[PDB]
């Protein structure tokens, strides 16, 4: 019945089920919270993670939802929200389609939700994984309903997108490296009526500080909903359990400063800032993604970004081993271009952190990566896709403009017209192999149709030319070659996550294409 499991029914696991599920995968998750976190967690997903999202139809209501928190432009440090205001303060579109989404997680999480039930993947939220084997045919997990009722869960495959403290990751015995952890916080979220304390303000974050509390307050968008995320310390004895339901209605109160406004106490969850980082993303039919692959420091909100592209990259490939149409090796490529991108990523936010709270070096200031650079830049260094002959390796990541359709890359995003409606590159990924030719490469159609064939798989062809037909994608500024790094009776062949996986830069006689394509394929798809 099952083909995937997932444990974990947060960022990731909800992006794994989307995906998934988007790739016809039967998939189970089971979340052991009865729902989504109403916590905001991480808030930013820079514009590679929407072009990830858009794939699945998810990045258009992501857009929508974040509309409602536009005017909360203003970062302020107070005494508390309604007492004294210390301080407060406030070109993408040749690169990507998509601009920076300020969403929180708990309005992002629904409408994964949302698009995962639409796919048909089984969602179970009240259920906790509480062990599970494997052996060479598959995986038997032990799920506890929310009635304490237990059953065996039998699938090919287990994700394990369940967080920092992943028991999955501890069960396989993968150790991880890293600074570690850095400061324990709990975040509590509340409801209370901003409107009355803020009046016309509207801020993205709040840094709170008096004599009873220390921490950061966030409002949501509608005005009815906060989170206080306050530090404790262990070397003075405190812990999680010293949060309980009055000392989070103290230190809320505190924050807002007025008494007069009726807090209603949601919940209460641990957070560690960490740097920590799996030694091995995939274990036998096990694969781990998200925070239990990676902790990452939250300056510059990576770690969210980092967990939505593992499950990016791992979908289509479980879909293709589940299919018989790739070998079980192409599932070990999601632990070689991935964990390289992880530990890189959890070092970049250990350096934002250090920039940030002007601790930094001027080393660790030149070793401090954009943002579009850290998410939009990779170069994954091996895995399911063919390097160009002669060409010099591209380090893991590099300013994303300056990349030209590079094996192991994001395709480039180049605008085009279908009859006269707006269409990018993107726009044809996301969903299966694709195959894209230059204005004089229309004999790479046969060759897309012999792989295609050969190994089982569909390949969809693009020619694009600055002409076009009916019906065909218009090159509308002649930049596609250019911008894929191929003459114009070259070919290059697009992963279902819009990653190049290979490409001929001249055109290829007669049936060479066809055997070279096959060839290359054959060996991205492990077979
Ligand atoms: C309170 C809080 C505040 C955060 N704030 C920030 C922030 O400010 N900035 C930032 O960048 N990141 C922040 N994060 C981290 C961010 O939310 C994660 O990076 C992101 O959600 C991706 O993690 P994930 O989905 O892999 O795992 P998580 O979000 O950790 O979710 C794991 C899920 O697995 C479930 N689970 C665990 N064990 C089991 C089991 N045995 N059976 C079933 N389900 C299980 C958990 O209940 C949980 O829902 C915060 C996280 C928390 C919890």
């Known amino acids: 019945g099952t083909r995937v499991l997932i444990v974990g029914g947060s960022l990731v696991g909800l992006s794994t089920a989307v995906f998934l599920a988007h790739h016809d995968?039967?998939?189970?998750?089971?979340?052991?919270?009865?729902?989504?976190?109403?916590?905001?967690?991480?808030?930013?997903?820079?514009?590679?993670?929407?072009?990830?999202?858009?794939?699945?139809?998810?990045?258009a209501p992501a857009k929508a939802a974040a509309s409602g928190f536009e005017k909360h432009r203003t970062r302020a440090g107070v005494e508390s929200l309604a007492g004294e205001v210390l301080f407060s303060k406030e070109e993408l579109a040749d690169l990507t389609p998509s601009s920076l989404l300020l969403l929180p997680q708990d309005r992002l999480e629904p409408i994964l939700r949302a698009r995962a039930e639409e796919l048909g993947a089984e969602l179970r939220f009240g259920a906790e994984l509480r062990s599970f084997t494997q052996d060479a045919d598959g995986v038997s997990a032990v799920v506890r309903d929310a009635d304490g009722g237990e059953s065996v869960v039998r699938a090919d495959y287990l994700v394990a997108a369940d967080g920092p403290?992943?028991?999955?990751?501890?069960?396989?015995?993968?150790?991880?490296?890293?600074?570690?952890?850095?400061?324990?916080?709990?975040?509590?979220?509340?409801?209370?009526?901003?409107?009355?304390?803020?009046?016309?303000?509207?801020?993205?974050?709040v840094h709170v500080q008096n004599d009873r509390v220390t921490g950061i307050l966030v409002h949501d968008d509608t005005l009815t909903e906060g989170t206080l995320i306050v530090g404790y310390d262990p070397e003075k004895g405190e812990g999680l359990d010293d949060f309980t339901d009055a000392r989070c209605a103290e230190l809320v109160s505190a924050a807002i400063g007025s008494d007069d406004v009726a807090v209603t106490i949601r919940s209460r969850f641990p957070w560690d800032m960490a740097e920590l980082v799996a030694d091995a993303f995939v274990s036998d039919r096990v694969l781990v993604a998200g925070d239990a692959a990676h902790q990452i420091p939250p300056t510059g909100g990576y770690g969210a970004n980092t967990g939505i592209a593992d499950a990016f990259n791992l979908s289509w490939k479980l879909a293709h081993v589940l299919a018989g149409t790739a070998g079980r090796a192409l599932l070990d490529t999601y632990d070689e271009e991935r964990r390289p991108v992880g530990l890189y990523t959890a070092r970049q936010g250990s350096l934002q952190l250090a920039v940030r709270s002007r601790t930094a070096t001027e080393e660790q200031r030149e070793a401090a990566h954009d943002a579009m650079r850290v998410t939009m830049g990779q170069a994954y260094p091996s895995g399911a896709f063919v390097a160009d002959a002669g060409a010099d390796p591209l380090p893991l990541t590099s300013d994303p403009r300056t990349l030209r359709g590079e094996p192991g890359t994001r395709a480039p995003y180049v605008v085009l017209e279908r009859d006269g409606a707006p269409l990018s590159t993107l726009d044809l990924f996301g969903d299966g192999f694709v195959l894209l030719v230059g204005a004089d490469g229309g004999s790479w159609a046969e060759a897309a149709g012999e792989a295609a064939a050969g190994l089982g798989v569909g390949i969809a062809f693009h020619r694009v030319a600055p002409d076009a037909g009916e019906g065909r994608p218009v090159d509308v500024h002649g930049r596609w070659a250019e911008a894929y790094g191929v003459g114009a009776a070259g070919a290059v062949l697009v992963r279902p996550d819009g990653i190049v996986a290979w490409r001929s830069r001249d055109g290829m006689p007669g049936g060479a294409g066809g055997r070279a394509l096959t060839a290359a394929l054959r060996t991205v798809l492990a077979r």
């Open 25 to 59: 995968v039967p998939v189970t998750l089971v979340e052991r919270h009865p729902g989504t976190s109403i916590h905001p967690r991480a808030v930013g997903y820079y514009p590679r993670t929407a072009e990830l999202l858009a794939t699945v139809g998810v990045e």
């Open 165 to 205: 403290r992943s028991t999955v990751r501890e069960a396989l015995g993968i150790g991880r490296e890293g600074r570690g952890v850095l400061s324990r916080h709990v975040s509590i979220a509340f409801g209370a009526d901003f409107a009355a304390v803020l009046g016309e303000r509207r801020y993205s974050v």
